[PDB]
């Protein structure tokens, strides 16, 4: 799974049961990437 | 694979008759309570539809000639109780045919392809053979559309 | 946050006029003269440029997560 | 045979404006034409958006909303275009929709203005109106922000959504001197005169006309850009005639059914 | 959540009928035309064009609810003339007037463009 770091904005690939921490800067607030599922809006 | 009826209680175990006609000793935690199907229907040797609490006679199998009341029902076996029988407190099991009366679309992303919702993308929350509930990505509603108007993305 | 594409009341295009309005105000135009120079004659369209708060400039100060 | 015999006088015709006068018709006919101007003239506007990437400060439904309100040049194409509901295609095709794409990433240290110029259509006829004045600003991008989307623009009219309304301002009026007393002024001297008033400055109202009826109607139809302002009126007359023709067909079927 | 779809104001669903004629028995030679998926745009012109007919004794239209899309036109005519014939004549005159208006609009637009 790919988590974008909060402050350095670099993608981190971590597995399950691993602590949340950035590989580069050590910052531990990370966000999920946008989904690859097909998103569709009526332009309304 | 096997269900049973408790025929005797003990301090730390039970004696339970299986579907096959044998009474075995199993522990208290060794069994889980089964949701009883009181409304099951079975077929006898002459296609009379037998039910629970019906008075039936057994004309085949090990207990042939006996008469009892239906308590519990399963695929091909019938569980009976008879007050004259001293075995298992009157508990015994016979075949149903030995008696005589005395979805793959749910969770799939989908696109409406016909009708006034054509082009809308949704997720099928609930599906039947005729209609499917499509939870629409574009609005705040779950519509009900027939599956002939739906194509799977 | 950002200038509406359409005037709410009538539907005139006001989304292509915000940067021109800011450039006209930078050219020492009065706001009424700037609205007159942009073709906004109905007062429903004039309030779309007059009362607009460009919050997207303040939102663009924060760094993107990506 | 009680039909009116209405006449037309075009007093002004520019690229965004028709000022015309319809005489010798009814108020109901004039108002229905005015309502069809807003609600029943079909144009082409974006109604289907998928967003492959949106790193902007505006969310995805915001961008879709702003894309739907961008007018597209629907002249001579919306007539030969099918409705998506009435089309036999599975999803979309050139017979019922126009495909737009957008792929803008900001890699410079100044703000990138994603405007309607960045909307690229596969149909050379149906383009954003400002791409044929500045361009309609969709979003502003900071460095590292991206907007990548694919849209389909179908045909529809203003009765469904206001993005398919082809007009900006339909000015409509009749009896500019209040001869019919349809409005009653408490102080007639306090009221400004209209553009079409035929009164001298000392007068405030026309003398009351007891036998008069609304018989002359002044329009100023202003186009948002999707159609030429005369094309809006011609398509409105055609659409109202088509609605009445379909109603007469269903009425004939209902009469012969009984 | 309870938002009606935007096409429900003008699209007939399956099994819905565009126009239904019901002869009301209150007065002779009167009919009620219930038109689905229509609004004041057609009701007003049909009512006025029926009011132009000297053989029509009553012409009215109404929307029973603005949240529904249904027009009721009550037409009462003279005994030697039917309300259905009055409705057909009104629609025919409206179509002829609109075609004349469209042709004269094209002529006047060509006059304005050419000079
Ligand atoms: Zn980091
Ligand atoms: Zn406006
Ligand atoms: Zn198509």
From Swiss-Prot, chain B:
Signal peptide: none annotated. Methylated by PRMT1/HRMT1L2 and PRMT5/SKB1. Methylation negatively regulates interaction with P-TEFb and RNA polymerase II. Phosphorylated by CDK7 and CDK9. Phosphorylation by P-TEFb (CDK9) at Thr residues of the C-terminal repeats alleviates transcriptional pausing and promotes transcription elongation. Dephosphorylated by the INTAC complex when transcripts are unfavorably configured for transcriptional elongation, leading to premature transcription termination: dephosphorylation is mediated by the PPP2CA component of the INTAC complex. Dephosphorylated by the PNUTS-PP1 complex in termination zones downstream of poly(A) sites, thereby promoting deceleration of RNA polymerase II transcription. Changing residue 35 to E: Reduces the affinity for Pol II elongation complex. The modification N6-acetyllysine is found at residue 118. This is Transcription elongation factor SPT5. DNA binds at residue 75. It is found in: Nucleus. Residues 50-83, 104-137 form the KOW domain. The chain holds residues 545 to 753 of 1087 of the full protein.
């Amino acid at each position: 799974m790919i988590y974008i770091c909060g402050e350095c904005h670099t993608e981190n690939e971590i597995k399950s049961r691993d602590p949340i921490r950035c590989r580069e800067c050590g910052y531990r607030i990370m966000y999920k990437k946008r989904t690859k599922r097909l998103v569709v809006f009526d332009a309304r | 694979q096997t269900v049973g009826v408790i025929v005797r209680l003990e301090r730390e175990t039970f004696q339970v008759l299986n579907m096959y006609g044998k009474v075995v000793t199993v522990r208290h935690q060794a069994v889980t309570r089964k949701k009883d199907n009181r409304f099951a229907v079975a077929l006898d040797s002459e296609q009379n539809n037998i039910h629970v609490k019906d008075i039936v006679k057994v004309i085949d199998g090990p207990h042939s000639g006996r008469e009892g009341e239906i308590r519990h029902l399963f695929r091909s076996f019938a569980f009976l109780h008879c007050k004259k029988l001293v075995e298992n407190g009157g508990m015994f099991v016979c075949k149903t045919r030995h008696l005589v009366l005395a979805n793959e679309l749910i969770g799939q992303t989908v696109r409406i392809s016909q009708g006034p919702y054509k082009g809308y993308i949704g997720v099928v929350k609930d599906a039947t053979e005729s209609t499917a509930r499509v939870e629409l990505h574009s609005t705040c509603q779950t519509i009900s559309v027939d599956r002939q108007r739906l194509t799977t993305v | 946050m950002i200038i509406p594409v359409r005037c709410f009341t009538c539907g005139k295009i006001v989304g292509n006029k915000w940067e021109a309005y800011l450039g006209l105000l930078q050219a020492e135009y009065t706001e009424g003269d700037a609205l007159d120079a942009l073709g906004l004659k109905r007062y429903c369209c004039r309030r779309m440029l007059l009362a607009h708060v460009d919050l997207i400039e303040k939102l663009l100060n924060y760094a993107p997560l990506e | 045979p009680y039909a009116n015999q209405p006449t037309v006088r075009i007093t002004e015709l520019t690229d965004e404006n028709v000022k015309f006068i319809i005489e010798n018709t009814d108020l109901a006919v004039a108002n229905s034409i005015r309502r069809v101007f807003i609600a029943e003239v079909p144009i082409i506007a974006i109604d289907w958006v998928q967003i492959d990437a949106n790193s902007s400060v505006l969310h995805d439904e915001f961008i879709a909303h702003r894309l739907g309100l961008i007018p597209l040049t629907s002249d001579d194409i919306v007539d030969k275009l099918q409705y998506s509901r009435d089309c036999t295609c599975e999803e979309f095709c050139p017979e019922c929709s126009v495909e737009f794409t957008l792929d803008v990433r900001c890699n410079e240290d100044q703000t990138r203005h994603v405007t309607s110029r960045d909307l690229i259509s596969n149909s050379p006829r149906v383009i954003p109106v400002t791409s044929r004045q500045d361009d309609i600003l969709i979003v502003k991008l900071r460095k590292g922000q991206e907007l990548r989307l694919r849209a389909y623009a179908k045909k529809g009219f203003g009765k469904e959504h206001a993005k398919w309304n082809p007009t900006a301002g339909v000015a409509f009026e009749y009896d500019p001197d209040n001869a019919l007393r349809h409005t009653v002024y408490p102080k007639p001297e306090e009221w400004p005169k209209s553009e079409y008033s035929e009164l001298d400055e000392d007068e405030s109202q026309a003398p009351y006309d007891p036998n008069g009826k609304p018989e002359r109607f002044y329009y100023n139809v202003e186009s948002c850009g999707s159609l030429r302002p005369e094309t809006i009126v011609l398509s409105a007359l055609s659409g109202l005639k088509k609605k009445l023709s379909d109603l007469q067909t269903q009425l004939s079927h209902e009469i012969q059914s009984d | 959540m309870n938002a009606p779809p935007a096409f429900e104001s003008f699209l007939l669903f399956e099994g819905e009928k565009k126009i239904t004629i019901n002869k009301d028995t209150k007065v002779p030679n009167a009919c009620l035309f219930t038109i689905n998926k229509e609004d004041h745009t057609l009701g007003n012109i049909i009512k006025s064009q029926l009011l132009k007919d000297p053989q029509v004794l009553f012409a009215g239209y109404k929307v029973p609810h603005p949240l529904e899309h249904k027009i009721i036109i009550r037409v009462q005519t003279t005994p030697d003339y039917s309300p259905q014939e009055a409705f057909t004549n009104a629609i025919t005159d409206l179509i002829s007037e609109l075609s004349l208006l469209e042709e004269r609009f094209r002529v006047a637009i060509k006059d304005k463009q050419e000079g």
